[PDB]
Each structure stands twice: as structure tokens, then as C-alpha cells.
């Protein structure tokens, strides 16, 4: 019997799931589809990491590992909702919540003894992007379905106006970064390699004892110079200061050492260098680590009195006299860009800024132009290109702009997403080599200094072949041209270009428009096509998959959540991600304090539809196909009637939107002529929901406008949460009536 695995994650999509999962079960049941919820929240992965601190009834199965195993089975069907890639501050808050709820888990040891070392290494498995590289055992097919795009045309979202006199720009390192020192090769034979450091002292230091590589694999060695980074930060801060432009920092602190986000910490320390020069000793003696953001500092600071503490505060603020204005995460609560490494994440933050007309919030609460610092230049030039494009051509127009589907290479922890266990902080000056364990042959070499970050990346041949095949597939299906975003001046992408040229001859590409251009040129070409209403498929790497699928859909649709995101698993299974965005922690706020969830579940709906249709196609379950068809049509009706959630408290939210979806779905099922008994089963529900529409709607807007308790954040209580998320007794009783 068919099983759909439905992920329980964190925050907004979690709450939405508390309001929607009962609906899904009530619809999947008549079709003999089991709905199996899998808790992969941060709290859950924590508990699953530490069972030897837990009781009998407290313990939790390693659900992530289970899903991992499931990815290798043909009959697997996963609805993946966005989940938190926890930073250390978030991990800490979560741990606090658990312990306070009586789960007595060990504290996180920032500075460890030898047991606490081990528990830190264990807690590392709960840090950063721990889910997606496991689940993503196929390449990415992301695109906006035509009904969604047409809704976007009929009801354009707010788009910030772009000034030709905008001073907004991207500052990135022009030397000393991963890009500049990158080296790359394609293996001709299977090899086993070692990442080691030839210290100038003569001593060899091994950082990675063994990395198995396959024939045809593309590997890269890259490093970021600490000297170059810190100098870069200094010069950019001074430029921003002199020009009077607001400083912002846009990085992925999780694609780095999640325990030691060096790129972030250095920015913080250099910004406040005048303060840090005066309290270095006390900060060290306090265990201060601004790699986990300025927040960390503040925490360690609280134990102090208010004489040498307010002196610190005064020094930190004194630093603002010589440093530029600083972009804010929350102007109301005084949350700056430096507060936490995870607040401002490049993939979401840059598009947000571009959508705003090149602007972010300063301390005063106003939108201003910004120097958007993306230290790593590898994938940030494209942002400067689209920014100059907006400065020149004004903001985009969702009513007329074309679309940019993405075919993303990500299968088997491809590239930088798989380099978590091959990323090191260089301990001392010397030569960083990748050597054959058998021959001792140096495959790749870099000259590195102490404090540098050295990374090895791998992308395997089979995912590349499937990536090209998916590109061609999508080109032939959609009739859109395909553009491979590959910079031949980047060694990795050059190797990939060889791959693509080779594998394009393994498919009928006759009458297909398939080109390869550099990332910047590809971005430019794509925009020039966009403003003309022309479509272009972006066939890209993993990072670019992330970046572009946040950027373009936000411009086109207001949010990347309204996207179709299908991962055809290598083993034949299916994963369907509910959009391309994250867990939207800002929505949780408005919910807990105003009982309005502005989370759009359209991504869940689309993903679910694709899932049902695929189950139907694979198993020959006609009823599954019927659920697919009827759900897609019901989504069409949801869009036609603009029953999407509103931002405003007191107006339609996630729950009412879900209700309308249920209604339309029921109607579509009562109207179909393929399964009479099914039509009969859903006729009753359809009539009940259609009859009591105003009653249920009213029941859903009643509760709106008042603070609400879900009994937690990282581990909210199921019953309280379900009490809040399903407050319509009428609706609930209608669903319970089967
Ligand atoms: N695939 C994944 O699992 C995945 C991917 C990316 C990020 N994440 C995680 O998500 C967390 C937060 O990421 P972030 O704050 O950088 O970006 P984000 O979660 O995408 O949220 C940024 C903004 O996008 C809009 N948005 C996102 N999803 C929406 C939806 N379903 N309906 C309506 N609007 C939506 C919201 O804007 P408004 O405030 O204007 O409504 C939201 O504040 C991070 O911890 C990150 O690790 C997970």
C-alpha cells in the first residue's frame, strides 16, 4: 500500500501542517494512501541524537536516518517542508526549551575536558544543513506552474521602485577568496585521497585521512585567505563609512563551519575592533565568540555588573562613530545584521533587498541603499548584474515578465553541500594537498596560511549525467531554451562544461535551444529575456539552484514558496519540496501574538498534487491520479478566487485558505466522472463545506486579533498548537464525519 511521508519541521510550515495534515489524511484515506508524519524538527533531531539522556517515553527514533534509507527505495514518496538549518544560537535556544520541558539534554559546550568534546561533535550533527543533503538524492526540477504565474499576473505583489541613482551594489573580494585560488580536476580512475597540510615546520598534518572518489568525479580544492578577508572587510567598511552608504552582510553561515562561522565572526570583530581592542582580555576570559553573533557577546556580558558592562556597551556604540550605518533585521527590537549569523541568509536576503528597490532597513526604521557585502565572489557577481539591470531598466513587472525555471545539480551531496566533512581551518602556514593514498601523488595543491578556510568539493558523474538528462527533458517538455550557467574561467565549472558538452550528445537535442554562458552573462541574457516576457531554463549548480530559485520566483510571484520543486530520486522514489523558501520565522511571530498565520501553503498543495499524480503513474492507483487531478484543479480554483492568505490580521489567513482548498477539492471530487463511489464519498463533504462557508470563515476570523499560546517555539505542544491551528469546530466536525 502507498505511503506518503509528510515531514514535521519547524516554525511556520510546522504550524501550517498542524492545520493541514488532518485535511490530507481525510482526503488520502478513500484512496488507500497512508499518511506517515516524520518529525525532523531541530528539537527532534536533538532528542534523537541523545537517547542516553532520555527516559523510555521521551526517546525518539532517528527519523532523518530513516528517511535517508527510504531515499534508496523506489516506492518512497516524501513531502518535504522547509526546515531550520540551525545555527549555534538556535541550537542553544532549542536545548534550553527542551531541558526546561524536562528533557534533560546536555548543554552545548562552546568551549570544552574530553567528554564535552565528544558531546560537541555529537551536537554538530544537529547543526547546519543536516536534512537536505541527506534527502536530496536526486537532481532538482523547480518551476512556477502556469496557474501560479497567471495568478501572479492578475494579482501582482508589491515591488519596490528602483532608482537610476541607487548606490546599492555588491562588494565581493577581488582576490584571496575560494574563487581566486580555486583548482579543479576530473578523475579518469577511481582514487582514494587524503587532505593533508605540509607545515613549513616540516611536519605533516592530516585533516582528512580518507576520501573515496569515483571514476568521472569532479573535485575541487579552494581556500579563503583570512588576511584577504579581513582586509576586504576593513576597506569595505571604510568605503561604506566615507560614502555614507549602509553596510549589510549577506552570507550562508551554515554552508561554512557552522560551529565556527569565520566569515561572519571576522566581520563582527573588525567592525567593533576599537571595542575589542579594549576588552580583548575580558572577552576571552568570558568565552566570547562573535562567530555566533553579537548576541553571544551580550549573553556573556549579562553576568557582569553595570559599571564595566555599560563601559562595554559605550565602547561598542563608540565604534559607530568611525564605522558605517548597519543594516537591521528588526529595527523595532534593535536586531542588527550582526546579531546572529543565521538571521540574514544571502539566498533570501539579497532577493528581499532587490525586490525592495535595492533597499534594507537601517536603525531608524527606513529603507535605504546598501553596500551588500558578499565576501565570496563565486556566486555573488550575478547579484551585481541583476542590480545594474534594475538600476538601468527599473524594477521587474510580474504582469509582463517571463519566467526562469531551474534545473539544479544537487544529487548525492553535490559540490559545496557535501563539503561539510572536508572543510577545515588551516592551523599553520604551508601547503594544502589532496594526495593519492596509494601513490602519494598530489592531485591538487594550494598555498595556505594559518586561519584560512580550506575546502574540498566533489560532484559525481551519475548525478551530472542525470542533470544534463533532466535539462534536456525539461527543454523538450516546456519548449523553453536552456542555459547552462557555467563560468569557463572557474575550473570546476570548466570541468562541468566538458561534462555537459559530452553528455548533450547522448540525447536528441534536435530543435532544442541549449547554450552555455558564464554566470554573469547567463544572468544578463536571462534578464533581457525576462523583461520581454520570454522564458529561460537555468540549468545550474547547487548553490545557484538555491540562489536563483529564491531570487527569480520572489520577483515573479512575491515568494519562492509558490514554486513546484520536484526531486526525482535516483532509486526511483519521489521527493516534493513545498516551495523553494525557508521556514519563515517572522510569521510565527504574527501568529503567536495576533493569531494570524500569513504562511501560504500553496507549496504544500502543489507538492501534494505532484506526489499523488506520481504515485498514480507508478502504482496504477486510479484514485491517486484522481486526487492529483482534482487537487491541481482545486488549486486552480483557489487561485481564480484569490483565496490565498492575507498579511493583515483580521483577514484571510493560512487556515481559511486551507478551508477553501478543502472545499474546492471536495467539489472537484464530487464532480469527477471516473469514480462514482468516490464522487459520492466527497459529495457529502462538498455540500457541508459549501453550505457552512460563511460560518467556518467567521469561525476562523473570530480568533484573529488576540495573542495566542502554542506552548513552545522549537518544541511546541501538539495539543495547544492543534487547539490554535484548528479552532473551527464546524470545519473539524465536517472533516471528522469522513
Ligand atoms: N529547503 C529548506 O529546508 C530551507 C531553505 C531555505 C531556508 N531554510 C531555513 O528557513 C529558515 C528561515 O530562512 P530565511 O528567514 O532566510 O528565509 P525564508 O524562511 O524564506 O523567509 C523569508 C521571507 O520569505 C517569505 N516567505 C517564505 N515562505 C513563505 C510562505 N510559505 N508564504 C508566504 N511568504 C513566505 C516571508 O516574507 P514576509 O515576511 O514578507 O511574509 C519570509 O519572511 C532558516 O533557518 C533556514 O535555514 C530552509
Short mmCIF file of N, CA and C and ligand atoms in Angstrom, two decimals, residues 9 11-12 80-87 90 128-129 131-132 136 142 254 342-349 352 355 545-546 550 554 558-562 577-587 598-604 645 647, ligand 1:
data_model
loop_
_atom_site.label_atom_id
_atom_site.label_comp_id
_atom_site.label_asym_id
_atom_site.label_seq_id
_atom_site.Cartn_x
_atom_site.Cartn_y
_atom_site.Cartn_z
N UNK A 9 8.41 19.79 10.46
CA UNK A 9 9.62 20.58 10.59
C UNK A 9 9.49 21.61 11.71
N UNK A 11 8.64 25.81 13.02
CA UNK A 11 8.06 27.12 12.79
C UNK A 11 6.82 27.15 11.89
N UNK A 12 6.81 28.09 10.95
CA UNK A 12 5.62 28.36 10.15
C UNK A 12 5.06 27.15 9.40
N UNK A 80 8.43 17.08 1.54
CA UNK A 80 9.44 17.77 2.33
C UNK A 80 9.07 19.25 2.52
N UNK A 81 8.84 19.64 3.77
CA UNK A 81 8.59 21.04 4.10
C UNK A 81 9.89 21.69 4.57
N UNK A 82 10.01 23.03 4.41
CA UNK A 82 11.24 23.72 4.79
C UNK A 82 11.58 23.47 6.26
N UNK A 83 12.86 23.29 6.56
CA UNK A 83 13.28 23.08 7.93
C UNK A 83 14.47 23.96 8.28
N UNK A 84 14.59 24.30 9.55
CA UNK A 84 15.69 25.12 10.05
C UNK A 84 17.05 24.43 9.96
N UNK A 85 18.00 25.07 9.29
CA UNK A 85 19.40 24.65 9.38
C UNK A 85 20.01 25.41 10.55
N UNK A 86 19.93 24.82 11.73
CA UNK A 86 20.23 25.53 12.97
C UNK A 86 21.64 26.11 13.06
N UNK A 87 21.72 27.34 13.55
CA UNK A 87 22.98 27.92 13.97
C UNK A 87 23.16 27.59 15.45
N UNK A 90 20.60 29.13 17.79
CA UNK A 90 19.31 28.45 17.66
C UNK A 90 19.32 27.08 18.34
N UNK A 128 23.53 23.15 11.29
CA UNK A 128 23.62 23.44 9.87
C UNK A 128 22.62 22.68 9.03
N UNK A 129 22.94 22.49 7.76
CA UNK A 129 22.06 21.80 6.83
C UNK A 129 22.22 20.29 6.97
N UNK A 131 19.52 18.01 7.07
CA UNK A 131 18.45 17.26 6.42
C UNK A 131 18.60 17.20 4.90
N UNK A 132 18.66 18.36 4.26
CA UNK A 132 18.63 18.42 2.80
C UNK A 132 19.68 17.59 2.04
N UNK A 136 18.17 14.89 -0.44
CA UNK A 136 18.32 15.25 -1.84
C UNK A 136 19.19 14.25 -2.60
N UNK A 142 12.79 22.63 -10.41
CA UNK A 142 11.99 23.70 -9.82
C UNK A 142 11.42 24.61 -10.90
N UNK A 254 25.76 28.59 7.33
CA UNK A 254 25.56 27.16 7.51
C UNK A 254 26.32 26.33 6.47
N UNK A 342 22.62 33.58 11.43
CA UNK A 342 21.55 32.93 10.68
C UNK A 342 20.37 33.85 10.33
N UNK A 343 20.32 35.05 10.91
CA UNK A 343 19.21 35.98 10.61
C UNK A 343 19.17 36.35 9.13
N UNK A 344 20.25 36.96 8.66
CA UNK A 344 20.36 37.38 7.27
C UNK A 344 21.07 36.30 6.46
N UNK A 345 20.30 35.51 5.71
CA UNK A 345 20.85 34.47 4.85
C UNK A 345 20.79 34.94 3.39
N UNK A 346 21.95 34.97 2.74
CA UNK A 346 22.10 35.54 1.40
C UNK A 346 20.99 35.19 0.39
N UNK A 347 20.69 33.90 0.27
CA UNK A 347 19.73 33.41 -0.72
C UNK A 347 18.36 34.06 -0.58
N UNK A 348 17.94 34.33 0.65
CA UNK A 348 16.66 35.00 0.88
C UNK A 348 16.83 36.51 0.96
N UNK A 349 17.90 36.95 1.64
CA UNK A 349 18.08 38.37 1.93
C UNK A 349 18.36 39.23 0.70
N UNK A 352 15.20 39.76 -1.28
CA UNK A 352 14.37 40.65 -0.48
C UNK A 352 14.78 42.10 -0.76
N UNK A 355 14.05 43.13 -4.44
CA UNK A 355 12.61 43.36 -4.54
C UNK A 355 12.22 44.71 -3.94
N UNK A 545 21.24 26.89 -7.80
CA UNK A 545 19.88 26.40 -7.65
C UNK A 545 19.22 27.16 -6.49
N UNK A 546 19.86 27.12 -5.32
CA UNK A 546 19.36 27.86 -4.15
C UNK A 546 19.09 29.35 -4.45
N UNK A 550 15.49 31.23 -5.16
CA UNK A 550 14.93 32.22 -4.24
C UNK A 550 14.70 33.55 -4.96
N UNK A 554 10.72 35.05 -6.23
CA UNK A 554 10.31 36.17 -5.38
C UNK A 554 9.92 37.38 -6.24
N UNK A 558 6.29 37.06 -5.68
CA UNK A 558 6.25 37.62 -4.34
C UNK A 558 6.97 36.71 -3.35
N UNK A 559 6.88 35.40 -3.57
CA UNK A 559 7.59 34.46 -2.70
C UNK A 559 7.95 33.15 -3.39
N UNK A 560 9.09 32.58 -3.00
CA UNK A 560 9.57 31.34 -3.61
C UNK A 560 8.76 30.11 -3.16
N UNK A 561 7.86 30.32 -2.21
CA UNK A 561 7.03 29.23 -1.70
C UNK A 561 6.01 28.74 -2.73
N UNK A 562 5.63 29.61 -3.67
CA UNK A 562 4.63 29.27 -4.68
C UNK A 562 5.23 28.51 -5.86
N UNK A 577 9.39 19.05 -2.57
CA UNK A 577 9.59 20.12 -1.61
C UNK A 577 8.49 21.14 -1.80
N UNK A 578 7.96 21.63 -0.69
CA UNK A 578 6.83 22.54 -0.69
C UNK A 578 7.27 23.98 -0.93
N UNK A 579 7.77 24.26 -2.14
CA UNK A 579 8.30 25.57 -2.46
C UNK A 579 9.82 25.61 -2.42
N UNK A 580 10.39 26.80 -2.56
CA UNK A 580 11.85 26.97 -2.56
C UNK A 580 12.33 27.87 -1.42
N UNK A 581 11.42 28.24 -0.52
CA UNK A 581 11.79 29.11 0.58
C UNK A 581 12.05 28.36 1.87
N UNK A 582 12.26 29.11 2.95
CA UNK A 582 12.50 28.51 4.25
C UNK A 582 11.29 28.49 5.17
N UNK A 583 11.56 28.39 6.47
CA UNK A 583 10.52 28.17 7.47
C UNK A 583 9.90 29.45 8.01
N UNK A 584 10.26 30.58 7.41
CA UNK A 584 9.65 31.88 7.66
C UNK A 584 9.36 32.23 9.12
N UNK A 585 10.42 32.32 9.95
CA UNK A 585 10.27 32.53 11.40
C UNK A 585 9.51 33.81 11.76
N UNK A 586 9.46 34.78 10.84
CA UNK A 586 8.75 36.03 11.09
C UNK A 586 7.24 35.84 11.18
N UNK A 587 6.73 34.80 10.52
CA UNK A 587 5.29 34.52 10.53
C UNK A 587 4.84 34.00 11.89
N UNK A 598 0.21 34.16 8.13
CA UNK A 598 0.21 34.61 6.74
C UNK A 598 1.01 33.66 5.85
N UNK A 599 1.36 32.50 6.40
CA UNK A 599 2.05 31.46 5.63
C UNK A 599 1.16 30.92 4.52
N UNK A 600 1.68 30.92 3.30
CA UNK A 600 0.96 30.39 2.15
C UNK A 600 1.32 28.91 1.99
N UNK A 601 0.30 28.05 1.99
CA UNK A 601 0.54 26.61 1.89
C UNK A 601 0.47 26.09 0.46
N UNK A 602 0.36 27.01 -0.50
CA UNK A 602 0.27 26.65 -1.91
C UNK A 602 1.38 25.70 -2.34
N UNK A 603 2.56 25.85 -1.74
CA UNK A 603 3.67 24.95 -1.99
C UNK A 603 3.35 23.53 -1.56
N UNK A 604 2.76 23.39 -0.37
CA UNK A 604 2.33 22.08 0.12
C UNK A 604 1.28 21.46 -0.80
N UNK A 645 -3.79 33.42 1.48
CA UNK A 645 -3.78 34.14 2.76
C UNK A 645 -3.43 35.61 2.59
N UNK A 647 -1.78 39.27 4.52
CA UNK A 647 -0.78 39.63 5.53
C UNK A 647 -1.46 40.21 6.76
N1 LIG B 1 14.68 23.90 1.92
C1 LIG B 1 14.77 24.25 3.20
O1 LIG B 1 14.53 23.47 4.10
C2 LIG B 1 15.18 25.65 3.53
C3 LIG B 1 15.54 26.55 2.53
C4 LIG B 1 15.92 27.83 2.89
C5 LIG B 1 15.93 28.20 4.24
N2 LIG B 1 15.57 27.32 5.19
C6 LIG B 1 15.56 27.71 6.61
O2 LIG B 1 14.48 28.61 6.90
C7 LIG B 1 14.87 29.49 7.96
C8 LIG B 1 14.49 30.93 7.63
O3 LIG B 1 15.08 31.33 6.40
P1 LIG B 1 15.08 32.88 5.94
O4 LIG B 1 14.45 33.72 7.02
O5 LIG B 1 16.48 33.19 5.45
O6 LIG B 1 14.14 32.91 4.62
P2 LIG B 1 12.62 32.37 4.48
O7 LIG B 1 12.31 31.31 5.52
O8 LIG B 1 12.42 32.06 3.02
O9 LIG B 1 11.72 33.64 4.89
C9 LIG B 1 11.97 34.90 4.28
C10 LIG B 1 10.64 35.53 3.88
O10 LIG B 1 10.10 34.90 2.71
C11 LIG B 1 8.68 35.00 2.74
N3 LIG B 1 8.10 33.63 2.72
C12 LIG B 1 8.78 32.48 2.83
N4 LIG B 1 7.94 31.41 2.79
C13 LIG B 1 6.69 31.88 2.65
C14 LIG B 1 5.33 31.30 2.54
N5 LIG B 1 5.13 29.96 2.57
N6 LIG B 1 4.30 32.16 2.41
C15 LIG B 1 4.47 33.50 2.38
N7 LIG B 1 5.67 34.09 2.48
C16 LIG B 1 6.80 33.35 2.61
C17 LIG B 1 8.31 35.68 4.05
O11 LIG B 1 8.14 37.08 3.81
P3 LIG B 1 7.07 38.03 4.56
O12 LIG B 1 7.69 38.27 5.90
O13 LIG B 1 7.00 39.25 3.66
O14 LIG B 1 5.77 37.26 4.62
C18 LIG B 1 9.53 35.39 4.90
O15 LIG B 1 9.65 36.31 5.98
C19 LIG B 1 16.37 29.36 8.14
O16 LIG B 1 16.62 28.76 9.41
C20 LIG B 1 16.83 28.45 7.01
O17 LIG B 1 17.82 27.52 7.46
C21 LIG B 1 15.20 26.08 4.86
#
